[PDB]
Structures are given as structure tokens and as C-alpha cells.
Amino acid sequence: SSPIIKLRNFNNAIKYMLIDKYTKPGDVVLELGCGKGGDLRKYGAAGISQFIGIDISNASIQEAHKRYRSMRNLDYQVVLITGDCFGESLGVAVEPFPDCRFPCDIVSTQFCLHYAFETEEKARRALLNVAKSLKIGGHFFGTIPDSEFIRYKLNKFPKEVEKPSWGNSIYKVTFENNSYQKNDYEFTSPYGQMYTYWLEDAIDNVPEYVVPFETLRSLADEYGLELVSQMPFNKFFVQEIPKWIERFSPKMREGLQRSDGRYGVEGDEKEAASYFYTMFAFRKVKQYIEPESVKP
């Protein structure tokens, strides 16, 4: 109905499309930054065997527990853990939860990996956490702001603007500084490139960090993860929607359909959801061995 509701419907559609594209029956899923568990139920149709949700917010995990408790137990085991997925090794978080079945098949980071790019140390710790958790042949997928859209918008500001900002009725980005423009329209470093993000009734002016996708790809490769797909939300939706029209309920279709009959978003939610964000998927191709770790 409202632009922000259509954004939420669209992003939920994206997550269904992403999860069901790469997740297989029987998979063990590690959901990092799982929040209140809003995607827990999206794995049911995929037929997974175990969902491990980790989030740094104990309040969100408590709410995840409460929402799961009122649910009848699904066909998969659910493990919900309060823990820092980006600034600490995952072993600390999951050690009290021996039911976790590692190595897993899927690592999912939905709308959260960009918080790991606060520093190189945190970005590397997050990606090592992802890589070490996975089987060879496992997949790492997720959703982050598209650095190429961010660069496109940043490139429009003259160097004199001290705090480049843009948005529309439902979102706003405010960069901490103009170092990008002063640096001939390139980030001075891949990490800690901070902007405050506002999303109506979702994110209340919280700092987050650009994820220059070439750096995410380079780091992933260093830790044994090969890019399978990276697509802005609008192009991913176009690619997947032909197989999903029949799967969505009537109300779900109605909440995704435009007046010209196509499915997707228009208006302010078009930029806020379908341009601002990209999906990605990596496959683990080799086991990372820490440099100089093999001793006599």
C-alpha cells in the first residue's frame, strides 16, 4: 500500500528468490546477523535440515526465540545464538551449541554484512568466519548496498559538499565526509567508509559502511570463495520473477504488481530497494589455510 510497505514486500520477495535459488533440501544454514529471525520461515519450502541464527543483539535473539516458541516446531532444527559474527571468531558463539552441524551448506548474511566493513580487521574476520563454516561446494549469499549505485550517487557531488547526502521519502544516506570526492572520486580505503542510513520504520539513522564489491570479491577469493553471481536487486528480481509468479499467493502477487502489469517496484521504493541493494552469491572452492600456520 504505502511505499515503505511495498519496499518490505519487494525485499522479502528478493530473499525468497535468493534462498530458494541456492539452498537445497537437507542443507544446514548459518544465518549471520539473523535479527529477530524474519527469514527463519523462508527456509521451510527449501526443506533444510537445520537453521543456525546468530545475531549480536540479545534482544533480537530473545525475540527470535519467543517467535519460534509460539510457532509449531518446523521440520528443521532451529538454533538461535547471541554472538558477534564479525568482530569475533564464530567458535566463541557456537561452542555452547554442540547441536550445530558444521561445516554447513549455506551461509546467509541478509542486510548486515556491510556492518563488517567498519574496519579491514572486521571485514576479514567476518569473511574468515563465513569461509571456515562452509563445506567445499557450500554457498555464501546475501544482500548489501550496491557500491556501484553508491559510487554513481557520490560521483554527482562537487568536491565542496562536506557531507554528501541523498534519499527520498523513505530512505536517506548521509556520508560522514567528502574524502571520496576530494580523492578524485575514489574511496581512500575500502573500509570504514561510513554513512548514516535511514529507512522508514526500519533503520533509525544508524552508521553503516560501504562494501566496495571488488574488495568483498577480493577478500572472498583470498579465503577460498569464488563469485557465482552479483546482481542489483532490480536485475535479480527480473531474472527470478518468471519462476516465482506462480509460487506467490494472490496477496503476495498483488503487493508486487505494478499498474502496467509487470512485477517489481516503482516510485521511491524503486530506488530505495531495487537500485540501492545488490545480492551476491559465492561458492567455497578451496579450504583456506592461514599463512605461516603449518609448523614442523
Ligand SMILES: Nc1ncnc2c1ncn2[C@@H]1O[C@H](CSCC[C@H](N)C(=O)O)[C@@H](O)[C@H]1O
Ligand atoms: N557484528 C555483528 N554480528 C552479528 N550481527 C550483527 C553484527 N552487526 C550487526 N548485526 C546485526 O545485523 C542485523 C541487521 S538487520 C537484518 C536482519 C535480518 N538478517 C533480516 O534480513 O531481516 C541486526 O540484527 C544487527 O543486530
